[PDB]
Ligand binder design. Sequence first.
Ligand SMILES: [Cl-]
Ligand code: NA
Ligand code: NA
Ligand code: NA
Ligand code: NA
Lengths: 460, 216
Amino acid sequence: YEYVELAKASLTSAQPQHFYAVVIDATFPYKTNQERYICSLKIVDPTLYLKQQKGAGDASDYATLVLYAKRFEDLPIIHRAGDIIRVHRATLRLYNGQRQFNANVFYSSSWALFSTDKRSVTQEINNQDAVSDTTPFSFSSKHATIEKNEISILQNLRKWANQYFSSYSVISSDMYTALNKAQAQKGDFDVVAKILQVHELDEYTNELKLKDASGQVFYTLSLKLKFPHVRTGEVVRIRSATYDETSTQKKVLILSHYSNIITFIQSSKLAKELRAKIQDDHSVEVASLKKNVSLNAVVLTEVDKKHAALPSTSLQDLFHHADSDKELQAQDTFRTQFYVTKIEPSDVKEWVKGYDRKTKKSSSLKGASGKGDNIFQVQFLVKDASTQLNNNTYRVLLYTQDGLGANFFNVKADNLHKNADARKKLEDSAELLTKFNSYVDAVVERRNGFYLIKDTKLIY
Amino acid sequence: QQQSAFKQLYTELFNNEGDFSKVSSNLKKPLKCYVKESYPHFLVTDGYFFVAPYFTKEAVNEFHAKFPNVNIVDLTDKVIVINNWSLELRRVNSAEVFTSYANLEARLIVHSFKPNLQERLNPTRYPVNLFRDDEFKTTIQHFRHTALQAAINKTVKGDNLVDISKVADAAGKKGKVDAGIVKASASKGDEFSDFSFKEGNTATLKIADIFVQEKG
DNA sequence: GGGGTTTTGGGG
DNA sequence: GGGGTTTTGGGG
DNA sequence: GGGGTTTTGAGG
Ligand SMILES: [Cl-]
Ligand code: NA
Ligand code: NA
Ligand code: NA
Ligand code: NA
C-alpha cells in the first residue's frame, strides 16, 4: 500500500487511494435507511490543516471523509478529537470546494484507528494499557495489518498531531456557536463547552451541565451507553445540537442520533485553556432554591479533593451486592450520589445527642450536658437512580462520635435545644436535603454493615 | 409560555395527580396534529413532540363511517383533528412501552378525530418523544418523589436509629449491608406502587387490530 | 477485477 | 453463489 | 455528504 498526503491526493485518478490522517471531527455513525449507515468526519495532516492565514483568522482547513456501511459495527466511533485514522481504498472528489474522500466499507474499503495519546478513550475508561504503540484500538473487517514501513508514518503523524493541537485551536471559532447565541440559530449548531456536572437522571441517561466560554449554562441529555466518556471538568465539542424552545425551566440542548460528544487529546491547547478559563457556576442552583419546585437538579455537597478521583458506586451495588461482589468486598471506602427521602430522627433538635465514650451510649440533650460529648447521630433514608423503581429506601449514617462527617453541616455539633443559631441552620439544611431534585455526592466508609458519611460537606 | 401543546397538557396532568378534571379547561380544545407515523406505531406531533394516541373502538367505527375512503393505518404524513379526547395516567412497563417513563404513561384517549386529507402543515423541528424530554422526565420524577416521600413518612416511624454502639468500636464487628435496607411502603411487590392517583381505565384498540380491520 | 469462499466455473 | 461494480464473462 | 433508524423506538 502506498499512502498519500491529503493535499497531494489526485482529484482526477478516481482510483482508490490510501492515507493516514488526524480526525478533528466526526458525527456518530448513524442509520439513513433500511440498509445504510454513515459516518462523516473531518481530517487533517501536515499538508492540509490551516487556511491561508492572513485574512483567514487562523481558521482550520481540512478534508472530509464519508464512510459508508451496511452495518453499524462497521463504522468508527470517534469519542476523541486528535486520534489518527488509516483508510484504504478511498475515492476522492471535489464537493462544494473541498476535498472529499469517500469509502464504501461495505465493499472493499477499510479504516483503522490509532491512539495519539498513550491510551485510547475506551482504554482510559477501563484503565487498560495499549498492546503497543503500533496496534489499532479499532478497525473494520476481521483483520488489520501494520507493515514495518508504516511505523514511521504513524510515529511522525503522532508527533505532528501533538504539535498541531498544542499550537492551534484545531476546532476554530468558525466551527461552533456560543451558547448565549444558541437561540438565534435557525437549525442545528456545534458547541465547545466544559462539563461542569454529570447528573445520572436515570438508568440509561446522563444529564450534562455545560458552560462554554460565553458563560452561558445549558443542559443536555447524554445516553450512558453512547457517550461513556463524559467526565466532569473536561472540555468537549458537541457535533450537532439544537436549541429547545419548549424548555422553559432551564436552557436545554437537544441531540440527535447522529450527534456526537468529543473530547480532546492531552496536548490540546483549546481544551487546556477552557478547563482553566471556564469556572463552575452555581447561579442555577441558587436561584432554584427559592422555588417550591425545581426542575433543575442541585448537588448539595462536595467531597474532599483527595476523593475527586474516586469512582462512584450506585446504591444498587452498595446495598445488594457489597457482600457478594469480589471487587466490592475489597473496599471499605466508597463514593456515591443519592437523594434524601427522609431524615431521622424527625425532630431536628435530636440530631445532636450527648455521647459517653466509655459506655458507647448516646442520649438526648433535652436534659442537658449530663450526657457527655455532643455528636451528630443522623440517619438518612436515601434512594438513587439504580434503585428508583424498587420499594426500598436505604440507610446512610452521619454518626460523628469518631470524627467521621463531623463538618458535614458546616455546623459544629451543639445542644440544639439551647443553641438557636445551630438549630436554625440545621432545620434549613433539612428542608433542602429532602426537597425534590436535591442530591448528595458523598464519600462513605463501611463499618459493621453500615455506611457512614465522611469527608463530605454541604456547599449551600 | 409553553409552546408545545402536548408538553403542557401532559405536564399539568402529572402535576395534578393524574386528575384530568383539574387540568386547565382552556386546554381541552380540539387538537390539530401532524401524523408522523401510522404503522407499526401511530405517532402524531404537535410541532415539537410526538405522542401515541389511543383510539377507542367507538372512535374508529365512527371514523370508518364518515370516511369510508380513508384507512387510518395509511394516514402517515397526513393531518388529523381530534375533536373529542381525554387524558389518563396508566401504570406500564417502560422497558416495553417507549412512550412511557418510570413505569408511568399519560395516554391520549381519542374518542373522535377527523382526517383533514391533503392539508400541508407548516415546517417544524424534528419531533421528539415526549417521554424522552429532560424537563418532562423530571416532571414525572417529581411526581414519584412526592408519592414516595409521602408513602415513606407514613410507613417509617419510631426513629429506629442504628444503635451508635454498632458503628463505634467496630474492630471485631462485621455486618451485612442489607441491614440498611428499609421498606418504603406497604407495597405488595418489590416495586414501589403506593400512588394516590386512581389509574384511569378505558378499553383501547391495538394498532394491529385496526390493521387487520382494514386489510386482513 | 478481486473477496471470501467453495461456487472451484459462471449470474445478474 | 452472491455484492458491488462494471469486470458485463471469467481468476485464483 | 451538516445527516432522520427502530428485531435498536434507552448507541444506531
Ligand atoms: Cl462490615
Ligand atoms: Na467470483
Ligand atoms: Na469463487
Ligand atoms: Na461483475
Ligand atoms: Na464477479
